[PDB]
């Protein structure tokens, strides 16, 4: 029943939004619908428009003394709020009708559709060495009044508000993730067998990862140490292909694997943000203004492979490293997903 609203600094132009967050069901997205409230006597000759834009923004917005974002406009949409447009698309919405009931004549609804080929709201962790905020893709709604679309923007006229787009976990479990690797010697037939498995393929933040690793060291070398870690992969694509990978959680056990022996164990690794408050380049979930959040939720690609290289893509993997004596170190990897469940 409650309804958010934002107003112009002059107090004359006000916009109402019923929701702050939107979700996608891998086939459709919740439409962005709202109503702008304004008395036409203030303008009496201008026209009101509301614009949807998504940009690759860097830095902060509080008049920092530094070169600001490389403002790449990934996608921009415009709608004519005033003068009134025809009925589509397609009808007015229920909440817009209720708000028009609440206000009356000066209520003007608008409709928008979000294309399916858009990235998710993510924000990179700013570094203490740097200043202000950091780079990150964000959504933004902008409403303004002017006689022309190309008229100069005014602080008193234009109003800026920030919205978010997030995904939620599907209810269908996937195949069981497992991996194996057998490495022999240079000449002798003796080999080194290792197998890694996980309880599930989809987990939840704060839930420990019970990795099941089995080592069949039917060889002559002795494994000195064992290292288990999870790696975060962040694909950066604006006009070139890039990927910045940073370790997030590492666990080491002082276990010796004797030659011609089989050793299997289950280890616990937990990703958390407390220990990485200073690590630059970390990817985090989209924030409102500056509020803290958890780690960046693993966004899942749609069924269509297409391109979808229009922003930041994130994925997680787990690697286990065996410290074999006199070289011969062998490591195995396993991809997995980790992102929020569906609320009610």
């Amino acid at each position, epitope marked *: 029943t409650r309804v958010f609203k934002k107003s112009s600094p002059n107090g004359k132009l006000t916009v109402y939004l019923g929701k702050r967050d939107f979700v996608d069901h891998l086939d459709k997205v919740d439409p962005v619908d709202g109503v702008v409230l304004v008395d036409p006597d203030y303008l009496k000759d201008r026209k009101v428009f509301v614009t949807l834009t998504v940009a690759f923004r860097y830095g902060r917005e509080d008049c920092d003394v530094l070169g600001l974002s490389f403002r790449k406009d990934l996608f921009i949409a415009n709608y004519q709020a005033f003068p009134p447009t025809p009925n589509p698309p397609r009808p007015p919405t229920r909440l817009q009708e209720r708000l028009l009931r609440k206000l009356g004549q000066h209520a003007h609804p608008f409709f928008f559709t979000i294309p399916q080929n858009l990235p998710s709201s993510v924000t990179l962790q700013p570094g203490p060495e740097d200043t202000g905020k950091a780079l990150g893709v964000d959504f933004e709604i902008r409403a303004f009044v002017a006689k022309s679309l190309e008229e100069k923007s005014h602080k008193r006229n234009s109003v800026r508000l920030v919205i978010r787009k997030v995904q939620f976990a599907p209810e269908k479990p996937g195949p069981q993730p497992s991996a194996e690797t057998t490495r022999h010697f240079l000449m002798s037939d003796r080999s080194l067998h290792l197998e890694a498995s996980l309880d599930k393929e989809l987990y939840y933040h*704060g839930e*420990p990862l019970n990795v099941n690793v089995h080592v069949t060291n039917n060889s002559t070398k002795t494994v000195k140490k064992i290292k288990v870690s999870v790696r975060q992969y962040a694909d950066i694509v604006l006009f070139s292909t890039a990927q910045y990978k940073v370790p997030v959680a590492q666990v080491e056990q002082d276990d010796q694997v004797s030659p011609s022996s089989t050793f299997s164990k289950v280890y616990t690794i*937990t990703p*958390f*943000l*407390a220990n990485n408050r200073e690590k630059r380049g970390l990817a985090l979930d989209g924030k409102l203004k500056h509020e803290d959040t*958890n780690l960046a939720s693993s966004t899942i690609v749609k069924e269509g492979a297409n391109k979808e290289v229009l922003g930041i893509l994130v994925s997680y993997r787990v690697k286990v490293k065996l410290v074999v004596s006199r070289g011969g170190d062998v490591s195995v990897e396993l991809p997995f997903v980790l992102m929020h469940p569906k609320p009610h």
Partner: antibody, heavy 119, light 109 residues
């Protein structure tokens, strides 16, 4: 899912004590631990809070510096230590858990232990 | 700063299946971060309504509430012969949390 705790007793005012509250059936990381005291004839009063995932600590205004909190992740147990006991700190103390993502109240509560301070 | 709590009424008595309403007041506006708790005498507290509108699982539907600005009201459909206890009003959108003054319920004769 169960909640257990121990460490109650009678301590002379001005001393110190250590209380424990083990957690089972869930995770310390995916939740937060809250401590609340209930004086005889008075309502429950929150004292401190811990957020292991965010690594933040909070205390009440009346127990700033006097009361400390701690938790070991391996054993899934939380420990709070209070110092410089006064006669007005006697109450029944409870340890409770709250869902981290996101906050929706205090769904589960421990049975609670009484704290008595006097000479 | 601290947010004042003003529960009303403090404690009254009624009969089985009666109209009972409990009102909560706050010195500062809070959107929806209001929770309702009930604690039987000598036992552990237990919540009934969280977010001021959501009914917790394993709870009879007779309990309900509503919000009007800073006014928070608890409504009970019919009084069970085991609901005679105290109730507390809680807000959790500001640090620190502030608790209610307790609303004991008793049977009249």
């Amino acid at each position: 899912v169960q909640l257990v705790e121990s460490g109650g007793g009678l301590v002379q005012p001005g001393g110190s004590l250590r209380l424990s509250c083990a957690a089972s059936g869930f995770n310390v990381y995916s939740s937060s631990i809250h401590w609340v005291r209930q004086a005889p004839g008075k309502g429950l009063e929150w004292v401190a809070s811990i957020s292991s995932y965010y690594g933040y600590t909070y205390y009440a205004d009346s127990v700033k510096g006097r009361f400390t909190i701690s938790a070991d992740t391996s054993k899934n147990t939380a420990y709070l230590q209070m110092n410089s006991l006064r006669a007005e700190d006697t109450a029944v103390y409870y340890c409770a858990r709250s869902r981290q993502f996101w906050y929706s109240g205090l769904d589960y509560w421990g049975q609670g232990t009484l704290v008595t301070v006097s000479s | 700063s601290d947010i004042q709590m003003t529960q009303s009424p403090s404690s009254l008595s009624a009969s089985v299946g009666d109209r009972v309403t409990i009102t909560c007041r706050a010195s500062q506006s809070v959107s929806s971060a209001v929770a309702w708790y009930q604690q039987k005498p000598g036992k552990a507290p237990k919540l009934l309504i969280y977010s001021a509108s959501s009914l917790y699982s394993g709870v009879p539907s007779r309990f309900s509430g509503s919000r009007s600005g800073t006014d928070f009201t608890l409504t009970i459909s019919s009084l069970q012969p085991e609901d005679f206890a105290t109730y507390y009003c809680q807000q959790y959108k500001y640090v620190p949390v502030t608790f209610g003054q307790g609303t004991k319920v008793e049977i009249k004769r």
